[PDB]
């Protein structure tokens, strides 16, 4: 706890296969440019107060959603107009599952839908 929880969360995130080290926001755009909507990856944030950012190919182009790490649990940055509290997760696989609806939450009003992590090749 207090550091072990954080480092264990980071570790497991790094290990997940969703995570792309040494990829910028611009490079995420390139990687996701030719991919179908709902293709996503997690990468390092270039922001001072964030470790990680989720990049997702949406119906309306590539969007970026900062990941919050409070208490060593993960959540996606939430609009204060949310009527529900922010769901939070002790692992990234659960986070990702939560935002995989079948054909649901939205971004400012376009659906946020993850479907498949970006693969190498």
């Amino acid at each position: 706890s207090e550091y072990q929880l954080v480092v264990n969360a980071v570790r497991k995130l790094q290990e997940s296969g969703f995570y792309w080290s040494a990829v910028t926001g611009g490079e995420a755009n390139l990687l996701l440019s030719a991919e179908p909507a709902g293709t996503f990856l997690i990468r390092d944030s270039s922001d001072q107060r964030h470790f990680f950012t989720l990049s997702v190919k949406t119906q309306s182009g590539t969007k970026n959603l900062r990941i919050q790490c409070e208490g060593g649990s993960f959540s996606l940055q939430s609009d204060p107009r949310s009527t529900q509290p922010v769901p939070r997760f002790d692992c990234v696989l659960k986070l990702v599952h939560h935002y995989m609806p079948p054909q649901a939450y939205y971004i400012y009003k376009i659906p946020l839908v993850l479907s498949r992590p970006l693969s190498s090749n």
Binding site: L30, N64, S82, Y105, I107, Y108
Partner: peptide, 11 residues
């Protein structure tokens, strides 16, 4: 590439 940020509406 323009890098656009968003937040999620949880409702």
């Amino acid at each position: 590439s323009t890098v656009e940020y968003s937040t999620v509406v949880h409702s």
